[PDB]
Each structure stands twice: as structure tokens, then as C-alpha cells.
Amino acid sequence: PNPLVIERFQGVVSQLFQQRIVRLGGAVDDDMANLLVAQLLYLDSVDNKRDITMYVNSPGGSVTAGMAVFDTMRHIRPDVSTCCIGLAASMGAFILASGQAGKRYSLPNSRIMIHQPLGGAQGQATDIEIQANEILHHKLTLNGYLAQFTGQSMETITKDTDRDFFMSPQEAIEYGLVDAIISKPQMLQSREV
Amino acid sequence: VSQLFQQRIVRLGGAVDDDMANLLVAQLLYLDSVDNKRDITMYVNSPGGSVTAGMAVFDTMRHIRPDVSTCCIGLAASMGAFILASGQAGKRYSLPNSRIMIHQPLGGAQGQATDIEIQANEILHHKLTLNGYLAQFTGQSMETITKDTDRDFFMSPQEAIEYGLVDAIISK
Amino acid sequence: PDIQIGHGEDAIEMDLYRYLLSNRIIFIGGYINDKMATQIVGSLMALEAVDENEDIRIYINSPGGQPYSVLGVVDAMQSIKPDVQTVALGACYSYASLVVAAGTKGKRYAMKNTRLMMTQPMGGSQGDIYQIKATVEELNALYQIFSRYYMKFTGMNQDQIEQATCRDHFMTPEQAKLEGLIDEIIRGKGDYTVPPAIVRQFREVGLVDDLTPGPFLKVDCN
Amino acid sequence: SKKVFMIINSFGGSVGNGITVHDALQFIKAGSLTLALGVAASAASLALAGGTIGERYVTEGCHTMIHQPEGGLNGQASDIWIDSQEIMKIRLDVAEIYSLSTYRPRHKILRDLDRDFYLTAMETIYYGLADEIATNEVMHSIVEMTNQ
Amino acid sequence: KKVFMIINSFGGSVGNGITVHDALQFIKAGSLTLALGVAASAASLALAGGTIGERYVTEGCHTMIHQPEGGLNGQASDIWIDSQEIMKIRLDVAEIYSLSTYRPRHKILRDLDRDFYLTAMETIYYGLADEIA
Amino acid sequence: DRRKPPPPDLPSLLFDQRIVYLGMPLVPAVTELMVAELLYLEKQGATLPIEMLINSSGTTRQDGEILSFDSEGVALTSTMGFIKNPISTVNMGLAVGWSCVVLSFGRKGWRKSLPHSLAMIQQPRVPPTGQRQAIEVHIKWREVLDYKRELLRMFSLGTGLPVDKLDADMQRPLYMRPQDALEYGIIDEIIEPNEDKAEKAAQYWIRSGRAESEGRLEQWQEYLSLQEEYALKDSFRKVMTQDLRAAYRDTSSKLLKNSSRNMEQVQEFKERLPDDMLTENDEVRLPFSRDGVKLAILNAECYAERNIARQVAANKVSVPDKWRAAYAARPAPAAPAA
Amino acid sequence: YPEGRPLFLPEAERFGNPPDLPSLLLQQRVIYISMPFLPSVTELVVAQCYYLDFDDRNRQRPIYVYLNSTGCINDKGQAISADNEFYAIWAALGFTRAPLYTGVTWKAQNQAAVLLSAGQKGHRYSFPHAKISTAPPVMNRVFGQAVDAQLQANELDYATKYYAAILARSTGKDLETCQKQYLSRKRYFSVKEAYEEGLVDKLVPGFMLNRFRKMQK
Amino acid sequence: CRPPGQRQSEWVDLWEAYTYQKVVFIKEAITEDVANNMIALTLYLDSLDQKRIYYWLNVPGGDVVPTLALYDTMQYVRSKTATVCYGLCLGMGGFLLTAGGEKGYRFAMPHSILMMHHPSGASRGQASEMHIESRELVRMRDYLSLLTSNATGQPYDRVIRELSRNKWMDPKQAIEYGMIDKVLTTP
Amino acid sequence: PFGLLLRQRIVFLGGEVEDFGADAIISQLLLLDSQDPTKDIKIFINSPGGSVTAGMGIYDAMMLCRADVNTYCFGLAASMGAFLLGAGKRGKRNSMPNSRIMIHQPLGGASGQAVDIEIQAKEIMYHKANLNRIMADYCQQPLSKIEEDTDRDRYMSPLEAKEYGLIDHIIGGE
Amino acid sequence: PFGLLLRQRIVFLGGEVEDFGADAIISQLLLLDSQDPTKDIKIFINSPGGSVTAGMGIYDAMMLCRADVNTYCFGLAASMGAFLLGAGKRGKRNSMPNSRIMIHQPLGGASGQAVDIEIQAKEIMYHKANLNRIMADYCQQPLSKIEEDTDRDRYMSPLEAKEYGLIDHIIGGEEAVFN
């Protein structure tokens, strides 16, 4: 992108971080997850009590880097309240699910997509078994965690995440992925009737 | 480079081009503006370069006021070698393990019989000018230098001492 | 959308990773190539020069490394004065895996959901018969060095390493703690979920069956 | 010619093709004399073991390498799992075919398909994939059969 | 003695469909047109070009109907001219469909607007085909 | 006989005997050739049969790279419906996707396969649209849906199975060996290998003395020993599981609850008595494991090296140092520690 | 239907010359190996051998094998194919009956040099400026554990001992000697050096230079 | 459109079979290659005898020099020339449609699409090189416009003004404009 | 340059709406919300559009703010500049006199097996219905009319947009 | 962190050694010499090779330094890092217990008219002789043995090298030296 866009965004990122607001944007590769682990550790060191607000806006990401971020969220002292804006999809949705219970939010017009890990197995038959066990372990672990977060059952989750499962935040609340919707009052338009 | 630059060190590194020559010329002119007496030293490590850029660097070296001592580090090859041979007399140094190469100009041409013949005789002009300057710098005659530049002439630093390109070695 | 850093916001406002390194934390991400090994050894020695007695903490989230760079990093870890304390995150894939085992015994940690891995040194033969013999000797020397380091850190037999490295061996923190690669698992706020491999190990000793799988993940579909 | 002579020298090919040629060679009524020149890789080893038992010839300088099916596959976790199970079933099919062609147990065949497995002429005949060294008189007679 | 045209074409430029339709009508002994699987626009024109009474479609076949496509590039007036011809092409295709389906040409233009899919029975009813195999 | 020369090559040689060989991914050229050959073979006579050999990977490479479309198969299958003389379709090697429908679409009772051939069925996929509008995405989905339904209808005519079952099974790759295809409905027969060949092979292995001594006996013994050892180990695992459940029942016979009365209440009036429902709610009974077998003798093994336990009694008040906020957990008459 | 028997030169001289060049050379019992030992060359040479030993009445008419190939190794020294293509060719050329005369046009290298030596004693020809060279066998890059590379080393050592056996039989030397001289390092032979070591035996028959002819005129 | 159609006694390719009847199907945009093939075919067909050569065009465009070479070859041969338009004739194809048989022997199929535009071209170099190329291209525009005007009967100045942009015509507009002479129908 | 205007509470929504760009705009909006609750935020729009998810994310950050969110058009506002332009505070949507405002149904794609196609089509139909409802809510037109207009790319000048309801002021008047 | 180490007279030579990389290191060594002439420098070598020209540039810089220049290899030192590691002051060359040390000739090539081919063969042969001559001097082994060894493609453990004369100390006391 444009360097001036990058510089403006890095400035506003520093301001938000000052206000204890980390953010997870874009595909969650290893680099972003190392960065976000570093930010979470810093915010733990600065203050051990105040909440951290984690901005999730992601279209996907690596299972392994997502779990790096997820363990650091569940290990540090301050409660990481995850808030979804725009799109929490397939690993930002897992991250949004794993925010502090009762403190996961979503703006009204967002989309949550939870599904199972993609991937690929290559090589001789035995290498393909080993790699299929890696992918199936990741799938089972993530479904077990979604069952823990949402209050659903492992089988309902496994049935729901077989293919892409897009959800509005209302359906997410009614599911268990998100706990509240953030919105301000509007003016209810009077109709002539 | 700045860390070297404040030490009056100008690096002619890597094969020369017009951008590298522009950077060298700007450095040399600024450094002459700063101090016209205190010396400039210049590390040479280059496998060649365009003849025109080397000529630009050589003229900028010549007419500025500080002596541009040239110290060869690593290698100096047929256009960085000419630049190395053009440092101030008595101040063309070599490292003990560096190698020095001299060889004729190069370059292509395309166009009509007239245009590519013109490119041919400008290449002859480059060859004549370089041989004349090398004769000025070493002390050998046009014939020995033309024979040397005719075919790839790899040399050791010591030979270059008795063949005139370098003034001394830094074993010190 | 490369990356966007905080600053920590002191009177200087320097880069976040510079701040963390100043507070004695080294992050290892991506392949441990020669530049990464050089940076990690330089960081270890700078932290040693600042204070030779206070703990260094290393976070390892890396998908492997060049074997020689990893051996250099492990040698630097074992040759410095302070306690080195290695926390595994995300993944540590076989060469990085040794980097986790090389922390000060008692201070090797892994996050609850990391994926360690152990593999034979993989290389590759090509060319004349003497180049192929050279490759065989290189890969045998690497196998001996990494096998000896795994023996040194985990206490396993060379036979046990032979079984644990004959093929890509993906391990949870629980196998790693049973084997000796790590010392403590960093859990959540009381998170003790049993991973699928440990459930299978339950099934292999008869603790759970198909009739009574217990409150563990269903691995009846394997 | 009440025999179908099938001359083998091929460095690989998908194992399914080796299975197809093995089944076809075991299906036709007419006999089969399969000769290996130089090499017979996975599918070619299946085609070599597929001939009439007792007429599977291999030269002195031939090599026979048998390896387990290797595949590649991308997609969701369930798709990787299903393709994985299928590739294991193919490995078992190949092990059973070698077991029945050579009379070795499926477990020693499966142990050998663990890694790429090279066999010389004596090693191949001992193992059971071929039955006789191919001396010049063998296809002296083979050419004479095609001519007579 | 009658050209028997088997049609199974997932696509093609519509102008080529017009050209094949003209070639079909050129010969005087009737043409039978049997569609299999799919008959998209450039082949839907060909299917509608057979002899009325002797155009057949198969139970599985689906018919595509759509307006022509085009890319343009040049000055503003070049773009205007090129737009005018693509409109002429679309009007001609609607006219051909009107001749074969005996349906309001404006209605056929409305149906061309976006990609239009017809099952075998809807192909029969629309008028592009006459019978089912 | 001179007047008709020998056929120039192999495809002419086969097609001369009414053998339509479908062996290539079902591309438009292959589909056109198949249609031309089937129409020509009906022309030469609509009572003579056609032997179609299917070693094909459908409309997409096995890699998953889409290479034709979902309508080339519709053309070929509707063609096979159009030609009226009997078609026997033999599966060779691979019959994926539409090439499986074609295998199941031959004359019933004549569909066959080689003993190891694989018949896979999955759901059609399409190449990426390329960021079209919303209505064009809806219209593309309706296109893809109609063609998937066509595939389902033709596969229902082939196998015999409902549309809904086939749709459910198709959602993921479904791999079928000839036993499985014969079960499902794809094929009717399996082309067994020649019997005389197999008999001669067994006789040669016996008579030549190769089957006995080439190293075979030692490792066949090793195979049987490994099988017996692993069967016994699995039996010991089952024994361990059953003893764990027996321990749970030993330590669960000390209970005082009224929830069993509720489980009596919820159940129907007919099952007021314990009366199971012939379903996967199936209670396997361990306690009636009085096998009493006097034949299965314990081998010469010594378990007398196991120590002598303290012989603890559970009728104590001492409790393990745990935490529970419930105070309904009264001490039981047999468990004063509860 | 009828079995169409390929009729050979004694009785096929009445059917004229063949249309193109490769058919001409096949009829002359010349197998011209002009291209590196790829699977295509192996297939073609095996079929030519099968046709030549098919219906020769006397099968004493020798088979000529002219070489213009660097064998199974590319020009830059990295294997372009495997050693099994050579075995298949060599094995095939052995299942015939006729004496196997070999010659070199320009280059017989690394495998074609062995196949050159492997002709009849007294009947190996070369052009007087042919370049012959013997190099150790080369494998192509494969990935794995130390065990895979060890397996490749074993295979390459079988190949090296095979070539050393053929060169020992051809050049009449000690087996390990032939391994040391030829296969140990990539060594070049002029025609005279190759003749000195038994690689070749003669120039092509009738080779007479131009100014030599002039001065005998 | 591959299958060889049977001829007097054997199987001959469809387009060769057509040229055996003097019919020359031009179906590709005129590049150096197709133009050379059609010039060669025209010369040989005139060599066999002199009866007439029908050109069936489906040309969607083409380059200027090869098209003018084909035109000059058509005019050089003794045998007359008629041009029919199956499909469409665009640009230099619409110029070839006005290249054969001025006396009422240009036909078109009912839905054929006709287009004429001033010939394109592109070339750079020195300043004087651009002068020479620009002068030559203006000479080319003028020559092709003279040919178009004398083919259709429209004023030269009218043609210059009309063809500066693209010009598209239905067969009725082409008859009314003089571009063609008759429209083929079922007869 | 731009930062100096951000100091005056002005957000440039320029260039194609993208994931990175929308993330930057949302962060700027949240920060300008935190800095002062009751000072107007001005969003300048010159963009041919972008992803629907990014556009609704920016729309949510716009609606969440406690500050009136003026919108301005400079040149083009196409398919997501237009939706976000009308999504400004009513009575406070301005446009430059010679600027083009295109209304456009959302773009989406689909690839993979028939179930992937069905899921993507269902998602895009949801987005289309949602956007139609929002646009008809702030344009005060029937949902049917919005469906007809968004059917194809409709370009309006600020007069056609002002009568159609997307904007509220034209900065040069007439 | 490298700034503090450069203050401590520690120079890192890591990764592939190249022309620009050499110029940077040469400058660092000259700075450390001109600042302080009595305090030793430490150069750490983890490098898989390099260019002969750049390598000899760094070697000349190392041999100019008045302040004794120790070297400490970690991980790899392949055929040009190993030479520089052998060019530290005698008695002050160190290695990790499990570093891998390689000694080997350079590659090369030439093209076109074979005049330049013979000149390139002569220059590659010069590099061979030059490197081997100084290697023999510091390894304290016969030049014939060094010439033979620099041919053979092989790694060695720091124990083998310490025997061979290249390095002089192993950091770890040969307690973690694994084969």
C-alpha cells in the first residue's frame, strides 16, 4: 500500500495501543501472531488489572499462529475482551470466541464465520497419515474449544463447522460466540400508518 | 557509508554505473567544499563499469583540490583499476592480497552502417584516451600499455608496484 | 498490510521489540537461518554483557531452522552465564524443537496448545558417488549431534530417540512433559483439556472404551 | 501367439495404472511372459509381478524398486482425512497384490513399502517378483515364437 | 439429406451463434437440431435455427440465453460507436429469438438482460426446441 | 478377406468389435468422440451390444483441477440413454464423477469391474467466477444446482438409491471398491481372474518348491505369531476395560438416590418395566461373564510376585482431601465417608 | 486378418528403397544413437533390436551402433537421465545375435564411452577428432534422511561396478584398475589416447584426408 | 470444420475440396501468413484456368499491407472475382468485400455485419523517420479511400469524412451505401 | 499532509476500499471518537468502492460514533463510497458539484464445490438485502425502487443524487 | 544490541560473506583499531562461505589490526569462514563444542573465447595456491597435506580441527563435543 497510509495507520495504532487496544487485522500469519504476543506481554507488564480490548477484524489465518495468540490471551493477567468489527472469519472468529467470557462484543453489521481448518497433505502414504493426523488434531482441538466457549455440544459444533457457516452477530449471540452487540440508539422513524 | 563518509572515505565499490558515478561525484564535490586541504581517501573494489562514468569520476578526482588517495581493497578490474591508478602520485595503495586487472573497453551498438561505425570509432576513442592516461600514470610506453590492455591482464599488488599502478602496500 | 507496532510510549517511544529485548526477552520467529542465528546470539551476548546473572526469557514460535544455525544457537544458549528460560508458542518444528529443550532445566515451558515436533535431520543427496557419501556423512553427523543433544536434555535412550525421530513426530505439551523436552505447561485459568493424542493413549491402556469413552473427545471416527 | 510378451523398463507411473495392468494381465486367458530390462519401478513392478508365474524374467542388470503409493491432496480437514484413508487402502491393495504374487506375508511387504526399496536380479528373484534370469536364449526363443 | 446437428456447447460468442444460424437457414432441405447436456447462447441460436417441428432437446439439457458481451477501448466517440453496434447485435439476437419462439420481442429482450436458464421443458415451452428425446 | 484390410491401428481394432473405450478425462473432444462412436454403433445395428471400458477421471483431474464442465457428462449420459441397444460398461482402474455415472448407467446386470478398480463419486465444482455481481452469483449457483440435480437424477437411475441419500453421500469424496460398488448399486458383477491361470499359479508355487523354502516359512510363522500376540494383547486391553467398569459398579453400589424414580417416571407406560428398544441404546452385560470355560487353561505364568496389599476397608470416615460445596452428600450406611 | 510378415532385405530389395532416412539406416542394420540416453531413445533402440533379431536368416550381418551422445549425463555434468536407460539399451543389444560394431562420430561420453568400448574387439571406429570421456555415474537430486542418500550411494556403487566390469572386459585390464582409471574422475581421451587404452580400435574404414588424397593424386 | 469431404474419387480436405471448385474461403484476420496463403492460392487458381474465383469472407479485421497485396493479386489475375460475406467483414475485410467483382458480384448473408475504418498503423524512431512513416500512411489512407470510393460510388471526400471513425452497416445499409450488391437468401 | 487534516477531524476515504485501508479508516474513526465525543468528524470520499465486509465495517465505525459524521464527495463515490456517503448524518451529507455517485449492488464471487457456491451465494444475497434496506432507510425511498436502481450501475450527478436522497447539500449549490 | 557488542570490541561475521559485507566488516575493524590499539577484538564467524575476493579483503583487514584479533566460530564455517577463523591470532581462536568446520576449494567458470577461460583457470589456480599457503602456515601442517585436505569435501568437529591445527580452544571444555 501507499507509504503515507502505512505511516498514518502506524501512528493511530500507537495511539490505540496507548489506550490499551491491541488489534488483529488481516490474515493471522506467524509474523502478526508474534507481534500480537509481544503486544499482549507488554500490556501485561504495564498493568496487571486493567482490561485489554482486542480488535478482531480478520479473514482467516494460520491455526498455529492463532493458537499462539489464543494461549497468550488465556495466560496473561488482564482480561482480554475481544471485539469484532467487520469480519471475524475462521481464526479471528475463534479468537473472538475466546475473549473473556461476558466481554466478547460485535458491532451489529459484522459477520462471524467459523469452519474447520484447511490445509494439505503431500508425500508418501505414511507422510499423508502423519499430516492428516496433524490437521484432524487441529480440527478436534478447535471444535472442543468452541464447544467450551459457546456452551454447545461437540457434535453440534462439528456439524455446524463442516462447511463455512456465516453468522450475523445476532445469530452469534443466540449461538454463544459473542455476548453482546455494540450500538448506540437511533431515532425510531415515525410512520404515517 | 556516512560512518565512512565523515572519515573522508569515498567508496568506489562494485561495478560502476551512472548512478554510482553520480553518488561518487556528489560525495567528492561536497568533500572538496568542506575542506580543500585535508586529504580524501577512497576504497576501490570494482569489477568494471561504464567507461563514461569512470571518466566522470576520474575527472572529478583530478580537478578537485584535496588529493584523492586510492586504496585498493579486494579487487580493481579495468575500470576501477584505471581509477585506482589515477590516485595522487605516491598515494595509490593496495592491500597485500588484492588483485589488479586491466583490459579494453566494452559495449554494444545497433543501427545503420554509419551509426554503428560511429559507435566503433568512439570505442576507439575511449581506447586511445585510456591508453594515453595509463601511460601518464605508470610511466610505461603506449606500446607496452596497449599490449597489456589488449588481453585480460591479471596482476599481483607487487607487480603493480613495479609496473606503476600502485605506490605501496599496506602491510603496515 | 505488513505489520503495525506499538511503542511502549516512554520518554523515547522506541520500537516494541527493542523494548522487550531491553527487558530481556528474545523472540524467535520464522526459520532460524544464519541471520536469525546471528541476531539471537548477538542478543544473548548483549543481554549477558548488560547483566550476567539475571534470567533471559526466549519465546520460540518458529517452523524450523537450518541445522547449523540451530546448533550455533543452542551452543550459545548453553555457553552463557544467565539462566535461559525458553517458552514454546504456536509451533516448534524439530530444529526449533531443540531450542526449547535447551532452556535451563526446570525453566523450559510450552504453552498449552503448542505443537512440538521431532524429526531425523533431513538433507538431500545429489551428484557423484563422493558427493553422495559426503551427504551421508553430513546427515549422519547431524543425526548424532541432535540425538546426543536430545539425550542430554531429555535423558531418553538413543533407542527411544530412534523411535521418537524415525518419522515426523508431532507432540503436544503433554508428551513433551512426559518425555522431558519441557518442564512445565503454561495453562489457562484452570484449563486441563485432554488433547486427542492423550485420549488415544487412554484407549490403548483400556481406561476408556467405545462403550464408555468418558468425557474426552470422540476419537471413534479414526 | 498364445502368449503375450510384455517388456518392462519404466521408472514409475501412478500405482493405479500398475494395478490396472496387473488386473488385465491376470484377466486375459492367454499366458504372459514379462521381461524386465534395466528397471521396473512401482507400476512397472506391479506389471512385472503380474505375468504368468514362472515366466517373469529379469535380466542380470535389472533393478526392481517398490514403494508405497505417494499422493498429494489439499482441502478441508475432512477432505484430507478421507483422501488419507483412501491412500492407506491403496497401500494395502498393493501390499496384498505383492503378497499374493511373491507369497511373502502382507506384513513383511508392508514393512518394505515403508521406504523406497531397491532389489537386484538375485534379490528380485529371491524376493519373488520375478522368476528367472533373462539369458540370451530366453528371448532368442521369444523372438522365434513371435516368428513361428 | 437433412443436416442433423448435435449441440452441446457451454458457451461461445453470440455473433458466431448468429453466423451458424444463418448457415443453417441457408440450405433448403430442413435441419434437425438435437441438443445434449447444454446449449448456451452461441449454441442456443443454433438450436433455435433448426426446422420448426424438428428441433429436439434431451431431458437433461439446459438452455442458456443471454445478451452479447464486449470489451471496448478508445476515445469517447469510439466508445459511443462501439456501444451502438453491440446494441444492434442484441436487437438482432432478440429478433432471431422472436422468429423462433413467436413471443413479444420486447419480452425476449427483457429476458436476455441477465443470464437466463431454461430446463428442457422450459426450452420446449419458450419455443427454442420442439420435442423431448 | 483381403477386401477388408487389417485395421490400421489399435483404436480401429477395438472399435471394430463394438468396444467404446472411454479412458480420458471427459473433455469436449472426448465427449464428441464418444457421441460419434455411440451413434455410429447404433447405426450399424441397434440390437448388437456395446462394451464400454471406463478408465477415466470424470470432468476434473484427480488433483481437483477442473478441466471440462458438469455438462459434458450430461451429454455422454443422455447419449447412452438415447442409444437403444444394450450397453455393458466395464470399469477399469478409475471411474470418477460422471465417469462413475456412465459406469452405473449401462445395462443393468451388465455393469462390471475389475477386482481392484476404484469408483469414486463426489459433488461438482466450478472454476472461480471472478468477482461478478450479486445476481450473477445467484444465477451461477442456480446453474450449478441444476447440473448437480441432473447428476443426482442420473445417478439415481443408475444405482437405485433415493436422491436425498445420494446427495448426502456425495458431499464428500466417496470411494468404492468393487465390493462396495456392488453393494451400493454402481456395478453388478466383478470380473474375477481366470481360474485356470490361478490354479496353475498355485500348482507352480507348490511343485517348484519355491513357496516352501525361499525364506517363506520363517516369516509366515513370524506373521502368525505376531497376529496371535496382538490378538491376545487386545483381549487383555478389553479385560482391563471390563475390570475398570466392574470397579465403577463395585464403588457405585453404595448409593442412595431418588433419581432412579424419576427415570422410571419419564419412560413410557409400556416400558414401566425395563424393556429396551432394539436400537443403539444397547446395554451390553458384563456381569453375566460366567464363562466357566475349563478348556482355556492359564499358561505357565507366575503372578505370585505381586505384593500383598494393605487390604484397605472402604467402611471408614476418612476422606480424600478434596473440595465440594454440596452438603446433600450425606454419609451412606456403607460409606460413612461418602 | 492375415499375419503380415515383415520381409527383409534379401527378398525386400524388390520393394525399393525406404522413404526416409531412419528407415534407410534401419535397413542397413545401422542403429544411429544421436541423442542422449533418454527413455525415448531406449524405447526406439529396443524396438530396432527386436526388429533386427526378428527375422535375420544368418544374423551374422553385424549391427552398427554409431554414437553422438553424452550418455545419461547432461553437458554441464549433472545427470539428465538414469543408468537404467543404459542397462536397457545394453541388455537389448545383447539379446541379438550379430556382432555389435560401434563407432563414434563426435562425442561418446560417460555412458556412450562404455557402450563404445563394448563393441567387437577390432571393430570399434571413431572419427579422428572424436572426443571420448569417462566420468563417474551421477544421480539426480532427491531429498530424505541419511538412509535415502545411503540407498542412492549403494545404487550408484552398483552402477560404477557395472561400468567397471564392462570396461574391464573391453580394455582387458584389472577390474579395480578400470574403476580407478576411468570412473574415478571425469577424464578425457583423444582418439590416440583412447586407442592406447583399448577404448577404440580403428578409424572408420576408408577414412582418407583431403590433402593426403591430393598428394597421392 | 475439419472433416475431409469426399471428392471425385477420394477423401480430400474441406478447404482443399472447396478450392478445387475455385471457391476461396478466407476465415482469419489478414496477417502476413493468411495473406500469403491466399495470394498464392489466387495465383495458382488463375494458373489452372480462367473461370471465376468466389471469395467467402469471415474476416474480423487485419493488417493493411497484406490486405492490399491480396487486393492487387486479385486484380492482377485474368479470371474475374466475386466476394460473398458469410458471417462478417470488418475493416480490411470490409475492404476486401469491395475488392472483387464491381459489377454486382458482392453478396452478403442476411445477418452479416459490415465495417470499414481508415487503416491503422504505428511506428516510431527519429523525427525524420516519423515524417517518412506518417507520409506513407497518409498515402495509404488516400489509396484505400480512392479504392473504396470507386468501389462503392460514394464521393471521395464523403468516404474520407465517414471512415475516420468506425463505420458499421447491416446488409440493407450496405446495399443502400453501395458497399455490396445483393443479399443471399434461401435461393 | 493528511495527518495535518486528521488533526482537524477529517478522514480521507480515498482509493479502493480494501482490508488494510478499511482497517486504517476504522482505527482513525475509533481514535477520533476517543479524543473528543462531541466534535464533528468529516469523511472525505473519493473511491471506486471495495469489499462489502470492509465497507460495512467502516459503516459500523461510522454509526458507532457519538459525533455527527459529515460526509463529502470529491469526484467519484462508487459502490461503497456511495453507500458510506449516504450513511453520514442526515442533513450533513455534502458533495462537490461535478462529482459522480454510482449506486451498485454488491459484488461477490464463488469458487469450489456446489456447497461452497451455495454458501457464497447465500452470503451475497444477505449482503444485498441488508444494503438495500440501509440505503432505502437513509434515502427514504421504497425498497423496490432501490432494488431497481441498484440492479445496474447507476451514475448520478449530485442533483440526481440529492433528489434521490443520497446527499443533502451540494457545495456549489447550482 | 549489536551496538553494545561493537562497543565491547565484538564484531559479528554472520551469514554469507559478500563484497559489501566485507567492506562493512573491514571498516569496523579499522575503526576498532584506530580507536584503541591495545585491546583485543573478537570476530564471530557463522558463515557458509563467501567470495574469495571479499574473503581476502577481510583477511587483510584482520592481519593489519595491531590489536590481537580473536575469532569464535559458532554453527558453520564453510570454506571461507573457516579460513578467516584460522586467521585469528594463534592461541586465541575458539569454537563452540558442536560447530562444523569445512575447508574447501572455490568454484568458478568462464565463457566465450577460451583466452578468458585459460585466464580464469589461472586465477582459480592462484586462489587455490594463495589460500593453501597461509592455511599451511597457521595449521602448522605440511603444505602437501593442506593441499590434499582442501580438496576433500568434508565437515569436521572442533575436536578434529583443534587436532588439525585450525582452532586452538573449544568453548565448552570438550564436554559437549558430539560426533
UniProtKB/TrEMBL annotation, chain B:
The active site is at S78, H103. Belongs to the peptidase S14 family. It comes from the Eukaryota. The keyword Protease applies. Keywords: Hydrolase, Protease, Serine protease. It comes from Chlamydomonas reinhardtii (Chlamydomonas smithii). GO terms for biological process: protein quality control for misfolded or incompletely synthesized proteins. This is ATP-dependent Clp protease proteolytic subunit. The chain holds residues 72 to 243 of 256 of the full protein. Its EC number is 3.4.21.92. One of its GO terms (molecular function) is ATP-dependent peptidase activity. GO terms for cellular component: endopeptidase Clp complex; plastid.
Automatic annotation (TrEMBL), chain G:
Signal peptide: none annotated. One of its GO terms (cellular component) is plastid. One of its GO terms (molecular function) is ATPase binding. Coiled coil: none annotated. GO terms for biological process: protein quality control for misfolded or incompletely synthesized proteins. Belongs to the peptidase S14 family. This is ATP-dependent Clp protease proteolytic subunit. It comes from Chlamydomonas reinhardtii (Chlamydomonas smithii). The chain holds residues 173 to 389 of 411 of the full protein.
UniProtKB/TrEMBL annotation, chain H:
GO terms for molecular function: ATP-dependent peptidase activity; ATPase binding; serine-type endopeptidase activity. One of its GO terms (biological process) is protein quality control for misfolded or incompletely synthesized proteins. GO terms for cellular component: endopeptidase Clp complex; plastid. It comes from the Eukaryota. Belongs to the peptidase S14 family. This is ATP-dependent Clp protease proteolytic subunit. It comes from Chlamydomonas reinhardtii. The chain holds residues 73 to 259 of 282 of the full protein.
UniProtKB/TrEMBL annotation, chain I:
GO terms for biological process: protein quality control for misfolded or incompletely synthesized proteins. Keywords: Hydrolase, Protease, Serine protease. One of its GO terms (cellular component) is endopeptidase Clp complex. GO terms for molecular function: ATP-dependent peptidase activity; ATPase binding; serine-type endopeptidase activity. It comes from the Eukaryota. Coiled coil: none annotated. The chain holds residues 66 to 239 of 345 of the full protein. It comes from Chlamydomonas reinhardtii. Its EC number is 3.4.21.92. The active site is at S79, H104. This is ATP-dependent Clp protease proteolytic subunit. The keyword Glycosyltransferase does not apply. Belongs to the peptidase S14 family.
